[PDB]
Structures are given as structure tokens and as C-alpha cells.
Amino acid sequence: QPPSNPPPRPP
Amino acid sequence: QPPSNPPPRPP
Amino acid sequence: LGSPEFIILQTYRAIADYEKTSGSEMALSTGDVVEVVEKSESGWWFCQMKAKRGWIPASFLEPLDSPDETEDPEPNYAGEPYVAIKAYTAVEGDEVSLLEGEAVEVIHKLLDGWWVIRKDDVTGYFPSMYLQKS
């Protein structure tokens, strides 16, 4: 299971 | 095949 | 397709910094944790850094060789129905604010988890993890 928050927007 | 020189002395 | 194999290796910790003097050697920093592949009576050990691992943002990566070829699926401008399962307040000017339970049209499932959606006359980015297929 991945983290429970969305990834950051692209750099 | 290890390097062709001795390792350094222990720190 | 490959077959994964775990080789149980002895582990050790670096007690001082080591700088490579030849190509087949490896640099060390005090405290580094390494796995031992082979020991030599010469006093040289063939090792590998214990690798770090974990979840990372896909968007922070590019293919090794074909970095200009996009891997994203194609947009679907007709839209596919999804519903917000968690409310989200737009942070960036190009994001969409939704309330829990609001239905939207997904038009681009970007690999990075920030999908392009349509809600009536508004179009923008929204976290794929907060959406569920209808």
C-alpha cells in the first residue's frame, strides 16, 4: 500500500 | 579479482 | 520476465570514510551499511551498499533512455465517470476543488497521480487517489 496522501505535483 | 594493491591500513 | 532471488548477505557498518583509488572499488562514508558479497584474504571485501527502497513520486522519474517518449495513457476527452471519495481543496490555481460524493468526468489518467478531470464547465487536476470509478 502506497502512502495515504497524494504525491507532490511534478517538479 | 580484488584490486592489485594492498588495502589501506586500518583507520 | 525475470525471477527474483534473495541472497542472504552478512552486513557491516563503515567506521570511516573511504575514497576510491581504482574503478572496481567503492567509496564509503562513516556509518554506511554494506552487504558483503565476497571476502578476500588480501584484506579486500567485495560489497554493496544496503540499498534504500520505498515509495516515490512517479513524476520525479524519467526513463533511462527514452525520456522524451511519454508513457502516459492517451487522454479520453469524452470522459469517464468517477466520484470523489474524499473532499479536496485546490492548492494550485490549476487544481479542482471537490466535495465528497461529487461526480466528475476523468479525461486524462496521468501516471503521476494527478489526473485531469472535468466538472461541468471546469477542467483541472485532481488526485487520482481521491477518486473512485462510478
Added chain:
Amino acid sequence: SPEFIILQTYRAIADYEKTSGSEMALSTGDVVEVVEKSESGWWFCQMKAKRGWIPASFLEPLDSPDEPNYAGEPYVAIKAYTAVEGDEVSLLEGEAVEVIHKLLDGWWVIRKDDVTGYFPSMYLQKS
């Protein structure tokens, strides 16, 4: 882990700082192996193996900091070596010695006549 896996390799294009324990930090240029891709936008990766030869003496067990030999084993130098440190021994090729301690860090304790000290094991051979 899984029966089969096709491992794909990618390159980091920006620095990433972990915000939780299950994540991984990235530095631009890092080469990673992708284990699992989630539609959430998170990919589970491992840093590509970094390996090479290192000195055993620069290492210690993960836990902890850790006898006289009056009858040494006969060896002969196969290559000349000039002592660098004050506790090392200078030898020419062909010179026989008594090996006191066959230490694993590549620097053995030897004796020849009235001199004793450290000498590279890689330059000695059983006599």
C-alpha cells in the same frame, strides 16, 4: 516476494525528501529500479545496486566494537615493498619471513631477524 518480475529502471530528475517512513529519498540523477506502479502516482522502487571492493578494516559488525604466536609460519616475499608507517617492515623479493598473525585486513604481523611489524599479505607466499 512475487513469482516473476520485470524490473524497469528509471532516473530521478529532481530531489525528493521523504515525508513518511515508507517513502524513499531521491537525489537528482539517482538510478532506481521500479518494483510496483500504483495508479495513485506512487511507485515503489529500490535504489540501483552500488557495489565494489572495500577495505575490510574500514568495517565493523553492526553490533559492537569487536593470542601470542611464538612459532610463526614460513613465508617469502614475492614482491618488494618499502615500509610506509613506522610499524611496517621493508622487504625485497625472495626474503623469507615468519608470519605471526594472518590478519584478515591484509596486513599481517611478520618477523625477520631482529625486525617485526606489518606487511601486505598479498606480497607473501608460503615458502
